[PDB]
Structure formats: C-alpha cells, structure tokens
Amino acid sequence: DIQMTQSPATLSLSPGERATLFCRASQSVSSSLAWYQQKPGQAPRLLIYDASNRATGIPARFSGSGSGTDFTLTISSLEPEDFAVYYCQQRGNWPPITFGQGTRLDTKRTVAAPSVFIFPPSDEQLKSGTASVVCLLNNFYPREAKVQWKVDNALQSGNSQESVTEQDSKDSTYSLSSTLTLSKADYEKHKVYACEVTHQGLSSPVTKSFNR
Amino acid sequence: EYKTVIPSPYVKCCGTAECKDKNLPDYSCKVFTGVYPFMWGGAYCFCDA
Amino acid sequence: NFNVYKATRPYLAHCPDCGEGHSCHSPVALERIRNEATDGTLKIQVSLQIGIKTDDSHDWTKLRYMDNHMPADAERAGLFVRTSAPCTITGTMGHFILARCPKGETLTVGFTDSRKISHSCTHPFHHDPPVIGREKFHSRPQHGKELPCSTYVQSTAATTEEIEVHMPPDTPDRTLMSQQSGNVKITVNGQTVRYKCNCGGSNEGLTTTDKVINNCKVDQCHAAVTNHKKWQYNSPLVPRNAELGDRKGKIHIPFPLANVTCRVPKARNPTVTYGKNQVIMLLYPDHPTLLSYRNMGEEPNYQEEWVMHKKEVVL
Amino acid sequence: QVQLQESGPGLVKPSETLSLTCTVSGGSIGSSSYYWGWIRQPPGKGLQWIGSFHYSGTTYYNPSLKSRVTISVDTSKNHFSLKLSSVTAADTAVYYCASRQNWNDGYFDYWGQGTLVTVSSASTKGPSVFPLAPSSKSTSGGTAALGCLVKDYFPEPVTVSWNSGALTSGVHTFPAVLQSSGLYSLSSVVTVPSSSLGTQTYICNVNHKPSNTKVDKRVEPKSCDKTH
C-alpha cells in the first residue's frame, strides 16, 4: 500500500492571504494526486485532480503542483468561503485507493491562554456506578492543547479522553474537554487528582489539583 | 447513392453480448460467438473463449 | 474550421495489405472511399490527421499519426496516394484526402515515418470514372464543350455532414510486461495501465507507475492502457466501449459535393460524301467516340456504336 | 448533470448485514465511460475506500475488506448497492456513494448525501442529566461558567438548552464521544455573571427527539459554595 502524510496537521491563517499545504507520498506516484475539500455537514468536494488543472466549478485560487513523492497545494488568497478541511489522494497504485488524513484550515486569531476548570464527580455520578472527572479548557486559541492527568502519582494508561470544539459562540475561539473515566472503586481508592495543561499561550504548563 | 453506417463493433469477452431491434432504414444486428480479436498490442482481453 | 480536432488523436487500424502482402496494424488505414463526384475526384478517409500536428496547433506542413499509445508528427511531403500511378492530391484536412487518381483496381495510401520508415495501406477498389458526355477522353482539352458534373470543392468549412468521435477503448499491449525469474514487471511510461492476473495475488489492479507482481508468468497476465485523454473516430476497425456510444465529439466532413461544369472534347469533323439516299461518313476518332443516328419520322430506329478507329460508315 | 442519493437503515447491530443503495438521477447506468464506488470516513479520521464498480463487468475491492464487501447494480431501477456482511463496531463511519464522470480514472467528482453507520449499543436508552455546578474556581474574572452533561443517551444528537429554551445565546457545546460501553455523553455549558444564579433558578433542558424524552434538571451553584 501507499500512504500519504499531510503537513501541517492544522493550519491557521487569516482570510485574504496566500496559503500552502504539503502532501508526502510513501512511494512515487508521478502526478497521481488529487486535492480535496470537505466542510462540516457537506460531502467532500474535489478541487484538484492529477495534482494539476482543476475540476469544473473550481476557481483558479487553488493551484496544485509537485511530483514523485512530494506535492504542494497553493491558495492565492483565502476568501471567507474557502475555510475547510483539505485532503490529498493518490491513485498511482490502487486498489486500495488512498486518501490523506486531513489538514485543518483555520483563520488566524489573537493568542488566548486556556482557562482550566475542574469538575469532580458529584453524588449523582457517584451513585451512578462510574466516575467521570472533567477538566475544561475554555477561551484559548489555537485549538491544539496537551492535557494529562495524575492520580496519586500512579502511571495511567488508556483511561483518559479528550474532545475539541468548534468556533466559540462568544470569543470566536476554541475550547477543549478532558475526562478521566474510572470505576467507582478505583475513584474511592484514590483521593487527590490533578489535571495538567500544556499550551502555546502559556509560558509553562499549569497543573491544577483537588481532593475529594 | 446510399451509404452504410457501421458503428464500432462491441467486443464483449468473458460474457455474452446482445442487441435490440431499431427502426433505422435497413438495420441489421448480430452476435457472433467464439471470437478472439487481436489489437496492435496483442490480444484484446484474456478470456480465450 | 480547423479548430475541431482539438481533443482528437489518430488511431492504429487493421490493414489487409501493409505493402509486403501481409495484413498488419497500420497507423494509416482506409475507412471509406467516396467517389460520388462524376469528374473522378476521390475522397479517401484515413486514420491519420493531416494539417494538424501534435501540440494541437494547425500546420499544413505536418500530419500526426499514432505510433505507440501516443501520437507523433511527420512531414506532409512524404504522403502519397496511388492506384496504378501516383495520384495528384488536391487537398487534405484531418482524416480526409481529396485526390485525383488514374483508372486502377487498388488504392494505396502511405507516408514516411519520423524514423524514416515507410507506412502504407492498400485496399481493393475498382476506380473507373464515369463517362461525361459521349466521348471517352483522358484529359480535358484546349477546345471543346461544357457539361454539368459534380466535384469535391476545396472548401474546408462545416458542411453539416458529421462524423462521431468518442472515447477509444482500452489499448492492450504485450510490451508492458517483462518477466524476471517468475516476477512480472509492468512498466507505464506515463499512461495509466490496467492489469489482470490469475497468478500470485489474483487481484487485478491499476497502476500509473512501474510495479512488480511475484510468482507470476507473462503468459497469465493482461495489461491495457485505460486513461485515454483524447477521443478518436468510432471506426468499425476498433472495438466499442459499451452497449451504447460515448458520443462526446463531432467532426464535420470537409470537401462537400458541389455542382460544377466539366470540359469535354468535340470530335473532328468527319469526311462526308453523298450517294443515292445514302451518306458515307469517314470518321477519325482520337478516343472511343459514340456515333448515333435516328430517323426523324414516326419510327426512330435509333442506332448507336462506339467508334474507336478510323472508320467508314454508310448510313 | 448527474446526482446521487443514498438510502439505508443507518443503524445496524453486530453481525448484521449493512446495505446501502445509491440511486442515480439525471442519468443512467448505461452511460459514458466512468466509474462507480463507495467511500467511508470514520469520525476524526481520513476517508477509507470500500470498493468500486466498473461498467465493463469488473469489480474492485479493498483487500482488507474484500472478503465481506459486495457491490451490485440494478440497471432496471437504476441504482448501485453496497453490502457489508457481519458489520462490527469498528465499521462505524459516514458512508457516501461516489462516481467519476469524466476521464475514467480512480478519482471521484460526484457524490450523494452520505449517512452515518453505527453498529453497537442500543437506541432505546433515555438520557440522564448531571449538573456541572459553578464555583469560585470556575469564575472567569467575575463571570462564571456552569453547564450540564447529558450522559447515557442514544442515539445522538441531543438537544440541550437553558431555562425552557428562552436562553440560547452564549451556549457553548462540545463534540460528544462514544464510550467503550456503548454509552454516550455530551457536555454543554453557558457563561453568566454569578448574580443571576442565586435569583433565577437555572434549568438544563434536555430533549431526546428519537426517544421523545424531555428532562428539566436543576443546575445551581454547588452546595460546598453555598452558605448553608
């Protein structure tokens, strides 16, 4: 099989400026690469086929180029309607037909450090038979953040989850949720818990802790 | 003077082809079995019969 | 206009005689030979495209012909048409050649390749121009008479006579496979290739670059070129893609039939002598000349004969 | 030119047969040289290919899924159908039907309206509401954010509002994630000055349309922050 890797995984850049995306191939596929657009609630949309020219209805703002294993997609200018998730596909050797993992295109905004809040499980979840500890990062940009949990200084594996939201309803920013999911006995055994957050808007990682 | 219009023949291999009657002035259609046509690069397709 | 062949490419076709008495797949092949014109002009349809070269620019000095999965250019000056003696080509456009040929039984159209090799296709074709007038002449004379006839004009405009061009079928090629110790390697050279095998991994596939398939023999795999970026005439000498036609292109057939006058000779004045209810005419035909006579009464008693030599007839 | 429309159950069970039928409009199967196919995308991942159908009679399938994937065509009623047998929870993804009208290559440029296919859990579970109460630690410089979590509900989506739907401005929602038990949870918050919390009773209104379930749950500042 042949695998494509896109760069960067997430791109934030203001409307009206030039943009560039990279797609790297595991094997040389000549010019067998297509650049694809997808929007939330919408089916994927073809922009560039064979890493050149353009499909019908696709304006000249998109320009594909490259060869062999390296291909580039250039946007002359991002209008407000051009923000979507972009993909690269190879057809040089199929089946199977291979697509890229997707690059996230955002509009660049002002730096906002994440504000971290902790919600321990209350009696309504402690009587529910499970334990869900919530760590919320609100009002930060860009959207990517690092969240880790510490439970009585014991190394954890496979018992943490995270989710990233869309544009904020007030600040036009992004927020993140982290959840520690445990059994009732496991939560009752431990007492102190910590959520640590590393983000680009912070000079250093910030760790918040609580006791139950 | 008349001219005979002959669209390109349909080579269906690994299968059996069929056609439908048309209302053209003098229309004739037929299916021939067991053909193994070749092109300039070799045999058109694998299945030998 | 010349701008019709924008997205069309020539095609290789079967030819019953490639010059050495053996049928082969030629870049040039005769599709239809039309001789509706009564002055003898022939409109020969060939798989070549004359007047339009590769890179899709009009050029009367060049023609384009398919070589191997892709077209190539050649000079027009090497094009020749013959039946028994070389013909005078009065015009060319795309797939069509307007020529004048001597009486003959075959028709051969050929040219010179880029590699300085000759290509030719020969078809049996009874060419014998119909007699215009009452004299079988061989070239138009200085002094004579004019009679109605029909010819192929030089005009290359749209004539509402239309020919369909559609997407060509997959082009098989045995050259695309090379065997190395039970490994079949498929080259591409820039064209998408379909392959289907019943060895090793029996899963058929599609490539755009070179591949190798292990534990396989060249005998048990098939390859073809599928991504055709240009459409060709739906000639009866290439297979069809599906039950229906792709359509998707159209080309006007140039040199429409047009409605002209032809020059014919007038025979020499015969030497006429008289006798009792008798006319003795001595005739000097240069070429087979029709002599006819009738009575002007109720009984015409029409009589005719083709005088070919100096002859004395008593009427 | 041509249009695609998907149809299928959407929700399937383990070891059940998934069938998706894509009907073509503005055209027919017996058309110019081009492909058909099906594509699928798990949430948060790239697009994955199941299979493709060429009109010539050949079929192409993804080798990892070729053992169960069957693609057929009904030219009489003019559709093409994809069938996946013994579907597992790992196959939960948004499916689309696709075709490449022009130039007859492996790409795609036409699409329908794909549908989500989920394989595990059950859709008969009604929602449960949990208040994420505000606190002095949850106050963002004088303005505090309080919310509610809808846990143990299926199928998605779930409607979350505040104060009988009268307050919808400023509500921030999170993408909900399925657990490894078939259970689903979504957190929705709202940021308000704390002075309105102790004067107007704050209610999380949770509506589950597929089960037609309406729950109004009181969300108030945590008792540890109350002077009782």
* Cα separation, B8 vs C167, whole angstroms: 12
* Residues of chain C neighbouring B7 (CB-CB closer than 8 A): 234, 236, 240, 245
* Cα separation, D13 vs C23, whole angstroms: 63
**C-beta neighbour count of B29 within 10 angstroms:** 10
The strand pairing partners of A169, in sequence order, are none
A-D Cβ pairs (cutoff 8 Å, strict): 110
End-to-end CA distance of chain D: 70
* Cα separation, C78 vs C116, whole angstroms: 10
Q: Which residue of A has its CA nearest to C204?
A: A95
**C-beta neighbour count of C231 within 10 angstroms:** 19
- The amino acid present at C63, given as its one-letter code, is L
Ramachandran angles phi, psi of C32, nearest 5°: -140, 140
Q: If we measure between CA atoms, which residue out of C244, C286, C315 comes closest to residue C135?
A: C286
Cis peptide before A40 (omega within 30 of 0): no
Rg of chain C over all Cα atoms, to the nearest angstrom? 28
| Geometric angle at alpha carbon A37, from A34 and A40, rounded to 5° | 150
Q: Which two tokens stand for residue C155?
A: 């005009």
3-state secondary structure of C65: strand
Q: Does D30 touch chain C (CB under 8 A)?
A: yes
3-state secondary structure of C20: coil
* D204 neighbors D117 (Cβ within 8 angstroms): no
Write down the residue that tokens 């094997």 correspond to. A27
Q: Which residue of C has its CA nearest to B44?
A: C172
Q: How far is CA C225 from CA A91, A92, A94, C175, D164, in A?
A: 15, 14, 15, 12, 65
* C47 neighbors C39 (Cβ within 8 angstroms): no
Q: Which two tokens stand for residue D169?
A: 């401005």
| Contacts (Cβ under 8 Å, ≥6 apart) of D195 | none
Q: If we measure between CA atoms, which residue out of C208, C61, D8, C175 comes closest to residue A93?
A: C208
* Cα separation, A53 vs A72, whole angstroms: 13
* A38 neighbors A87 (Cβ within 8 angstroms): yes
Q: State the best of A30, A53, A71 to mutate against chain C, taking most chain C CBs within 10 Å.
A: A30
D61 to chain A, closest Cα gap in Å: 7
**C-beta neighbour count of D217 within 10 angstroms:** 17
3-state secondary structure of A211: strand
Q: Which two tokens stand for residue A152?
A: 């009585």
Q: Which two tokens stand for residue C145?
A: 């008479």
Q: Which two tokens stand for residue D35?
A: 């492909």
Q: Does C243 touch chain D (CB under 8 A)?
A: yes
Q: How far is CA A41 from the centre of its chain?
A: 17
* B30 neighbors B18 (Cβ within 8 angstroms): no
Q: How far is CA C107 from CA C42, C55, C86, C254, C274, in A?
A: 10, 31, 10, 21, 51
| Contacts (Cβ under 8 Å, ≥6 apart) of C248 | C165, C166, C167, C231, D32
* Cα separation, D141 vs D138, whole angstroms: 9
**A 113-152 residues with CB < 8 A to C:** none
**C-beta neighbour count of C205 within 10 angstroms:** 19
Ramachandran angles phi, psi of C247, nearest 5°: 55, -125
C178 to chain D, closest Cα gap in Å: 25
The strand pairing partners of A211, in sequence order, are A192
B42 to chain C, closest Cα gap in Å: 6
Q: If we measure between CA atoms, which residue out of D77, D74, D34, D39 comes closest to residue D56?
A: D34
| Contacts (Cβ under 8 Å, ≥6 apart) of A137 | A114, A115, A116, A145, A147, A175, A176, A177, A178, A197, A199
A-C Cβ pairs (cutoff 8 Å, strict): 27
Question: How big is chain B, counted in residues?
Answer: 49
Q: Which two tokens stand for residue A5?
A: 């890797």
D50 to chain C, closest Cα gap in Å: 15
- What is the helix (H) or strand (E) element at residue C59, kind and residue range? strand C58-66
Residues after which chain B is discontinuous, using a C–N cutoff of 2.5 Å: none
| Contacts (Cβ under 8 Å, ≥6 apart) of A91 | A29, A32, A33, A34, A97, C206, C208, D105, D106, D107
* Cα separation, C115 vs C27, whole angstroms: 14
**H helical segments located in A54-211:** 123-126, 184-189
* D161 neighbors D173 (Cβ within 8 angstroms): no
Q: Which two tokens stand for residue C307?
A: 């005088």
CB contact under 8 A, C240 and B19: no
Ramachandran angles phi, psi of D36, nearest 5°: -125, 160
**C-beta neighbour count of C120 within 10 angstroms:** 19
* C186 neighbors C177 (Cβ within 8 angstroms): yes
Tell me which DSSP letter residue A115 carries.
E
* Residues of chain A neighbouring C205 (CB-CB closer than 8 A): 93-95
CB contact under 8 A, C228 and D104: yes
CB contact under 8 A, A169 and D47: no
Q: What is the dihedral of CA C70, C75, C78, C80, to 10 degrees?
A: 70
CB contact under 8 A, D128 and A128: yes
- The amino acid present at D69, given as its one-letter code, is V
* D50 neighbors D61 (Cβ within 8 angstroms): yes
Q: Which two tokens stand for residue A188?
A: 């009752």
* Cα separation, D119 vs D40, whole angstroms: 14
* Residues of chain C neighbouring A28 (CB-CB closer than 8 A): 209
* Residues of chain A neighbouring D185 (CB-CB closer than 8 A): 132
Q: If we measure between CA atoms, which residue out of C51, C46, C8, C16 comes closest to residue C29?
A: C46
D60 to chain C, closest Cα gap in Å: 8
- The amino acid present at D65, given as its one-letter code, is L
Q: If we measure between CA atoms, which residue out of D80, D96, D194 comes closest to residue D136?
A: D194
C-D Cβ pairs (cutoff 8 Å, strict): 30
* Residues of chain B neighbouring C173 (CB-CB closer than 8 A): 41-42
* Cα separation, D173 vs D189, whole angstroms: 7
B13 to chain C, closest Cα gap in Å: 11
Method: cryo-EM
Could you say which of D30, D63, D105 has the minimum Cβ distance to residue C242?
A: D30
3-state secondary structure of C245: coil
Q: Is the four-CA dihedral A64, A67, A71, A76 of positive or negative sign?
A: negative
* C100 neighbors C91 (Cβ within 8 angstroms): no
* Cα separation, D226 vs D228, whole angstroms: 6
* Cα separation, D108 vs D35, whole angstroms: 8
| Geometric angle at alpha carbon D96, from D92 and D102, rounded to 5° | 150
* Residues of chain A neighbouring C188 (CB-CB closer than 8 A): 30
Q: If we measure between CA atoms, which residue out of A77, A94, A99, A86 comes closest to residue A14?
A: A77
Within 13 Å, how many C-alpha atoms sit on residue D215's CB side?
22
Rg of chain B over all Cα atoms, to the nearest angstrom? 14
* Cα separation, D89 vs A47, whole angstroms: 32
**C-beta neighbour count of D37 within 10 angstroms:** 24
* Cα separation, D195 vs D142, whole angstroms: 10
* Residues of chain C neighbouring D32 (CB-CB closer than 8 A): 167, 246-248
* Residues of chain A neighbouring C208 (CB-CB closer than 8 A): 29-32, 91-93
- The amino acid present at C310, given as its one-letter code, is K
A7 to chain C, closest Cα gap in Å: 24
Q: Is C215 left (phi over 0), alpha (psi -120 to 50) or beta?
A: left
Question: How big is chain A, counted in residues?
Answer: 212
Within 13 Å, how many C-alpha atoms sit on residue C88's CB side?
5
Could you say which of C172, C234, C238 has the minimum Cβ distance to residue B43?
A: C172
C193 to chain A, closest Cα gap in Å: 10
* Residues of chain C neighbouring A91 (CB-CB closer than 8 A): 206, 208
* A141 neighbors A92 (Cβ within 8 angstroms): no
CB contact under 8 A, C229 and D104: no
Chain C touches chain A, with at least 3 Cβ pairs below 8 Å, answer yes
* Cα separation, D44 vs D95, whole angstroms: 14
* Cα separation, A37 vs A57, whole angstroms: 13
* C69 neighbors C226 (Cβ within 8 angstroms): no
3-state secondary structure of D138: helix
* Cα separation, D87 vs D18, whole angstroms: 7
Report the greatest alpha carbon distance in chain D: 79
**C-beta neighbour count of B26 within 10 angstroms:** 6
Q: How far is CA C259 from CA A28, C37, C146, C149, D101, in A?
A: 61, 9, 13, 6, 45
* C27 neighbors C110 (Cβ within 8 angstroms): no
* Cα separation, C288 vs C131, whole angstroms: 11
* D42 neighbors D59 (Cβ within 8 angstroms): no
- The amino acid present at C244, given as its one-letter code, is L
Q: Is the four-CA dihedral D159, D164, D169, D170 of positive or negative sign?
A: negative
- Sheet containing strand D213-218, edge to edge, reads D159-162, D203-208, D213-218
* Cα separation, A55 vs D108, whole angstroms: 11
Within 13 Å, how many C-alpha atoms sit on residue D119's CB side?
19
* D95 neighbors D20 (Cβ within 8 angstroms): yes
- What is the helix (H) or strand (E) element at residue D77, kind and residue range? none
* Residues of chain D neighbouring C248 (CB-CB closer than 8 A): 32
**C 223-262 residues with CB < 8 A to B:** 224, 234-240, 242-243, 245
Q: Does A95 touch chain C (CB under 8 A)?
A: yes
3-state secondary structure of C143: coil
Q: Print burial letters for C74-97: b (CB count within 10 Å at least 16), e (below 16).
A: bebeebbbbbeeebebbbbbbbbb
Q: Which residue of C has its CA nearest to A95?
A: C205
Give the β-pairing of A115-119 and A130-140: antiparallel
**C-beta neighbour count of C100 within 10 angstroms:** 16
Q: If we measure between CA atoms, which residue out of C95, C65, C96 comes closest to residue C78?
A: C65
Q: Print burial letters for A92-123: b (CB count within 10 Å at least 16), e (below 16).
A: bbbbbbbbbebbbbbeeeeebbbbbbbbbbbe
D131 to chain A, closest Cα gap in Å: 9
* Cα separation, A11 vs B2, whole angstroms: 67
Q: Which two tokens stand for residue D132?
A: 């994420």
Q: If we measure between CA atoms, which residue out of C101, C108, C119 comes closest to residue C40?
A: C101
The strand pairing partners of D201, in sequence order, are none
* Cα separation, D41 vs D39, whole angstroms: 7
* Cα separation, A33 vs A29, whole angstroms: 8
CB contact under 8 A, A96 and D107: no
